[PDB]
Amino acid sequence: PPPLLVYKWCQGINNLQDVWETSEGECNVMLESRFEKMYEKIDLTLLNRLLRLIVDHNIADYMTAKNNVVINYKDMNHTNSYGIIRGLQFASFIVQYYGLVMDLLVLGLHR
Amino acid sequence: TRLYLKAEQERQHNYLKDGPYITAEEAVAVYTTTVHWLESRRFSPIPFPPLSYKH
């Protein structure tokens, strides 16, 4: 449960090597942020190229092919070509893998 | 709902008009980064379930 996540995060802040000692001018920084428009700015071809490394290629073609479909509202039809369809079943995988690609950009490969 | 649909239909046609907003070099960078990470962890790809996976 997410409150356990908060409790373990507080315990991890506490249990570092000399984390509250500021006798020599050390600093602690706590960044919190949100990836703006993470759901709308996923290109589907790049998603397919990054998705063919982990599954069979027909599976990746099926996962990319579902995102390119026409959305309708009662009079209005438009096709989708940029950004993922977030209400799919398997889309819970797509956000969690693509955001993993963000961790290689932020955190670095060595860390 | 109709206003957001008119905005979405406009921005999708703007993406189709202006081309891809990503460059090739950044795509090669993130692709080779993912290749180096998955080869660093020895990840075996997920196979297609052939005839009977028994799950």
Partner: peptide, 22 residues
């Protein structure tokens, strides 16, 4: 296999896609 090449694309958009995604 046999890469996707989205239903959709116009001429120059296909050219740019084949340029930057290959």
């Amino acid at each position: 296999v046999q890469p996707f090449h989205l239903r959709g694309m116009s001429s120059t958009f296909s050219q740019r896609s084949r340029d930057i995604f290959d």
